[PDB]
Structure formats: structure tokens, C-alpha cells
Amino acid sequence: QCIWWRGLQNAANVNQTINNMIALNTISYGVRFLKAKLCIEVYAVTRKRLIQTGA
Amino acid sequence: QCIWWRGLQNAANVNQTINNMIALNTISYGVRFLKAKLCIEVYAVTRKRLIQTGA
Numbered sequence A, B: 001q002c003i004w005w006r007g008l009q010n011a012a013n014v015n016q017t018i019n020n021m022i023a024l025n026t027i028s029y030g031v032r033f034l035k036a037k038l039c040i041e042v043y044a045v046t047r048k049r050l051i052q053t054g055a
Helices: A015-024 B016-026
Strands: none
Touching: A015 B016
């Protein structure tokens, strides 16, 4: 819903695609977001196993 | 032979195509000049007619 596609949650997340984008937003009068594809990849599913004796 | 295609002979001759070019030379590691087409258009051919009586 927001735009995190620039990866704002850390400024450490900038790639030239963002930079390419900025230079285009300078030379551009207008833009369209044509498609946005998100792909999650799960390398691991890790629970914390809690072994509890009393106290 | 030189590059006047940017229109250097006057700084008054810049169009966004030059500006577009500069922004691309920033985000680019390298370039090729693929084709250069020059077209002259002659709107007029005008000589100075010199009518000379003696002195």
C-alpha cells in the first residue's frame, strides 16, 4: 500500500535501480508504476524449541 | 571530426537532448555513438549585389 519498493526501511538499501529512478524522476514530467512483482523466498523455517522442566 | 553535436559554439544551444545525455553519461560506464545524421536546410541564397559607378 505504501511505497517500500525503494527500500526505505534502511537507507542502506539503495541500488542503482533507485539511482536510475531518481535521475529519471528529474528528467521526467510524469510517471506510471506499470507492474510491481514481489517474490518471497524462504530459506529456513526455524522455531525456538523450548524445553521446560519446572522452574 | 570534432564534436559540435552538443552545439558548443554557443552555450545557448542546449536542449534536453543534451541534458538527457548528461544524466546518461553519469549513470553510464560507457557509450557508443551509433549514428550521426546531419541535414542542412537552405532557406535562402543571398548575394550582395554591388552596383559600382566610378568612385
